[PDB]
Design a protein around this ligand. Structure first.
Ligand SMILES: NCCOB(c1ccccc1)c1ccccc1
Ligand SMILES: NCCOB(c1ccccc1)c1ccccc1
Ligand SMILES: CC1NC(=O)NC1CCCCCC(=O)O
Ligand SMILES: CC1NC(=O)NC1CCCCCC(=O)O
Lengths: 592, 592
């Protein structure tokens, strides 16, 4: 494994420190032992350790300015030495002093003339979840993250480029957004903007990430509210203050769906970050998305819903009124238990009342392909498998298979269960269907493994009990799978429970069923108690917040496909008003 | 839209400020640029902006006393200039200085001799929910709301009329009741009473609103408890203090049902404000309404209930004993499945035991019209549609329609479900029926849209499954609507679930029904979890407080219609006791 290699390598490093008396004196800060190993008896002063480290690298890991200066005065070429290992490919003695906030050592390293543009491209500095931190690659990025503002400016004084980016295309501004201490990073964020070129163009705040992401836009996708609020101050204009009233004008540029994909709204709903959902509730955004839904958002959803309501009620109209026949096959020739009246008409006549079904079946297929034309959570796979069954039913049609009902049956339930997709938004039943959206694809698929286990124990027993018996009376279990299906219904207390009082029931049934009825209710009551985990207040607020998320996700969805002659752009543009042609949303609020 | 017009107009205003260098210097407080545009090069000093504003109006929006004085010394006619726009029709430069609490500017504006009676009748000053504030129209009303007591008296010093009202008929006292800061408005409320004429008659506290509402009475209807408690000090008399005991005598004039509609109790239950419900729980009112219910309130409700219990049990007595006939029509001539024994007697004989039904049917109709005579929440539409069915049944009678049962059936359920209206009050089951009162007309009408959706998917499938089959055995679904009604019962687990073990069931039934049973229980368990939202403590207190509301609403209802020889007036009158002929309620309490 990779996690054990670094565990072994870190253990392997301490061995080379103990063995090499130079690195041992560099670790323990033994000043007298260094002059004994350098000036008197010349040791290998460029001694590479297990992690490709020098004696100075060890003298910097443990804050030892004395042992560092003895190594720099007796060998001033160890300063430029980078780590020559795989885990630490690139790290130098300045990176270690900047991390440990050793200002006097950074001062002495910069007096010696160390590199202020050395990258630490080792695997331990990569942005991975198994790495506990991520401060970038450059020494300026290390100083900004640890919060040492004295070292930050001290590095700029010696020629540190704020523009420089790492292997992931992140400037020093992008790295500060991925940090825990947000309340102190806002002060650090302003400090690095002060060293910008001063020109309105080619600003550091506009340098994009390699995935097309500005520092402002990254704060929303990552869920950093403190940096989102702080970055919002730079892009909002107050119009006037009238006592308690204050009408402020927000910029509304990267926070709107104007680019083909560069949009902060399109990144909040698509990302899986549970934190980013709180950014559309922020005071520049929540005003926007509320107006997008109250007008032109909510009505178009009802139109698309009502159209889908009629389209599905038409498909059912074609099923209830389909071909007929009082059964051309002879009689109950296979087994006597058979109630079949096959309703298959391969002919295209019956013109009186069949011409209505002709256009009805034509509507169902051109709508099913339109559903697929616009496709070429869970309600997404339901609507596509529905239209797949329509074409398979159309393929089952014109071939006239005896299994003409099996593909047509799935399209019934999938067609309506996808109209409760429109429960999203619309009213206050949206959070109810997002509560079952988690239920069907969360606990259900796991909870059934425990219920099928209890069934396959009692069902495979009840069949043995009534295998000796006669299925003609009390035939709840007669087949191998029909014993499972009857016990399945018995687990939910739907069937009356096998009870024939004229005959004599086997002695094992009256014992096994008593144990089944108790265990089945305990599994059902404990299932109800397990539902109480989502009943504390936050969970009622969580699903109600997740409901607004999929409402905003629907609002952005309708704006993309719908035309532009309807649905005007958000805000009032910067033309015809003395603005910068960018949009703006006038939002006035009242304090207290 | 109207909300975008003001957004555009506010953006359009800033354009005219930037364009007009007079208004730009008036906004930016550029003193040197004003003398360059007034004394040297004469600009249009009466420059009307986009919002009908002058240069002084802009110099007052942004606290700029320097730019204001330069405009007033070089043009002392801008002070009287009001805003000449639609949004701000009437606002002057004094209103803006009073709002911003610019005391030195108000002092300088009143030294110039500005109008202290100018109304701001613009649409933005109207009492609308889209307007964030509402301070009235007069400058004295602006000073009182912002809390600047120095400007309040400074305006009175220059001839401000406290009596003046706005377009809604509200004095300065009415406006203070609609404000958030109540703890500081009580101090401001006393300040404006001190400037009253000093005579006991024509007081400012007695000037009514245009909707018949005194400042005291408005505080109760609006739900302002702090002003209700403060206003109560002026109208309560302490009789004696006996250690911990203190018997106080409350006025009880506008807080009783004496006028035809001027009554604080009649306004608390009729209004839809959820806050006003806490005013009948206040310590002058709660003592009253408790005594009104314990005696003469609760017994009369039981009498009216017991009368309605017997009146409805009589209507059922007339239905169970109605005309008979062993069926005059021939046999089962339409379809063989028919169990009809029509019980229709158009003749008025059968005198032995029919004379009891004659007066019984006469009682049911004179009581149904009495129910309508006294009519010419939900239990209000139930009782009126019940008596509507009685007359329709009376019209169905004497015409002898074969549908004589359909109008008579509705009157059965509506007659009893309106006797659990008497669960209101009576005992502690009142809050239980107010819990289902929200259920029937709240979640139910919305929750059914999701259940009918799941039914119309599985019901329209089960019919297709058993359309090939023979309805004679396993005929749960045979008609188009009977497939819906059987699946509806199956959704609530009432029917045993279609199970015929002698025949062979179609292969799609055993698959579709397994999916229906799971989805039906998940919709039922998630419905039970959705009920837990009203289980936190306040909701138990909310419905118990809403129960007392409809109890008090019933207590006031019974006092209006019932005669006056019974049910004496509340309190002890001010005659025969040295009082002012007004109630009074003696209430003693114990402190600690
Ligand atoms: N290709 C259509 C996308 O619309 B979706 C959709 C629309 C109607 C019916 C079913 C699905 C959608 C589903 C889940 C999340 C967001 C959108
Ligand atoms: N016109 C009769 C009014 O009485 B109500 C009423 C009385 C008896 C039966 C049904 C209704 C009433 C209903 C709801 C709220 C307040 C009163
Ligand atoms: C073995 C080490 N030698 C060294 O000079 N630093 C070491 C460890 C610190 C690096 C931690 C980087 C990380 O885990 O993110
Ligand atoms: C555009 C404005 N010009 C001005 O002198 N005041 C302005 C706005 C303040 C009025 C706010 C009143 C309200 O919204 O209630």
């Amino acid at each position: 494994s990779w996690a054990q290699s670094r565990d072994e390598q870190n253990l392997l490093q301490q061995k080379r420190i103990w063995e090499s008396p130079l690195l041992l004196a560099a670790k323990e800060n033994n000043v007298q032992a260094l002059y004994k190993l350098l000036k008197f008896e010349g040791c290998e002063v460029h001694q590479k350790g297990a992690m490709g480290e020098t004696a100075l690298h060890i003298a910097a890991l443990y804050d030892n300015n004395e042992a560092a200066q003895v190594l720099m005065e007796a060998a001033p070429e160890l300063v430029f030495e980078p780590m020559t290992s795989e885990l630490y490919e690139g790290q130098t003695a300045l990176h270690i002093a900047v991390i440990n906030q050793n200002v006097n050592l950074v001062r002495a390293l910069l007096a010696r003339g160390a590199s202020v543009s050395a990258r630490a491209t080792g695997s331990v500095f990569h942005y991975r979840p198994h790495n506990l931190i991520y401060y970038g690659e450059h020494p300026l990025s290390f100083a900004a993250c640890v919060g040492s503002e004295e070292i930050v400016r001290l590095l700029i004084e010696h020629g540190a480029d704020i523009r420089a980016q790492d292997s992931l295309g992140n400037t020093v501004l992008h790295i500060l957004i991925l940090q825990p201490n947000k309340t102190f990073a806002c002060q650090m964020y302003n400090l690095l903007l002060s060293y910008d070129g001063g020109d309105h163009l080619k600003s550091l705040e506009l340098v994009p990430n390699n995935q097309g992401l500005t520092p402002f836009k990254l704060a929303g996708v990552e869920g950093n509210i403190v940096m989102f609020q702080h970055l919002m101050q730079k892009r909002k204009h107050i119009q006037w203050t009238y006592g308690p009233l204050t009408s402020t004008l927000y910029d509304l540029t990267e926070i709107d769906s104007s680019g083909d994909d560069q949009s902060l709204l399109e990144l909040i709903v698509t990302t899986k970050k549970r934190e980013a959902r709180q950014i559309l509730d922020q005071t520049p955004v929540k005003e926007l998305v509320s107006l997008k839904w109250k007008r032109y958002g909510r009505p178009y959803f009802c139109v698309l819903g009502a159209i889908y309501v009629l389209y599905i009620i038409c498909f059912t109209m074609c099923c209830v009124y389909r071909p007929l026949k009082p059964r051309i096959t002879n009689r109950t020739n296979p087994r006597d238990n058979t109630l079949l009246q096959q309703k298959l008409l391969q002919e295209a006549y019956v013109t009186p009342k069949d011409d209505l079904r002709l256009v009805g079946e034509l509507v169902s297929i051109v709508g099913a392909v339109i559903i697929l034309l616009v496709e070429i959570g869970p309600f997404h796979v339901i609507i596509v498998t529905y239209a797949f069954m329509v074409l398979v039913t159309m393929v089952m049609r014109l071939t006239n298979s005896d299994g003409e009902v099996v593909p047509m049956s799935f399209a019934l339930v999938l067609g309506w269960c996808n109209v409760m997709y429109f429960a999203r938004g619309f009213q206050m039943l949206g959070p109810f269907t997002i509560m079952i959206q988690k239920m069907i694809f969360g606990d259900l698929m796991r909870f059934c493994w425990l219920m099928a286990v209890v069934i396959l124990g009692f069902a495979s027993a009840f069949y043995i009990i009534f295998q000796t018996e006669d299925p003609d009376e009390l035939g709840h279990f007669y087949d191998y799978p029909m014993a499972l299906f009857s016990t399945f219904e018995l687990f939910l207390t739907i069937i009356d429970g096998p009870a024939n009082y004229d005959v004599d029931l086997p002695f094992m049934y009256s014992i096994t069923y008593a144990a089944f009825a108790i265990i089945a209710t305990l599994l059902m009551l404990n299932l109800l108690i397990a539902m109480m985990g989502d009943t504390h207040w936050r969970v009622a607020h969580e699903r109600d917040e997740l409901w607004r998320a999929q409402v905003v996700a629907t609002t952005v969805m309708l704006e993309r496909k719908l035309p532009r002659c309807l649905w005007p752009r958000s805000g009032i543009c910067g033309r015809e008003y003395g603005l910068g042609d960018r949009w703006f949303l006038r939002v006035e609020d009242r304090q207290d």
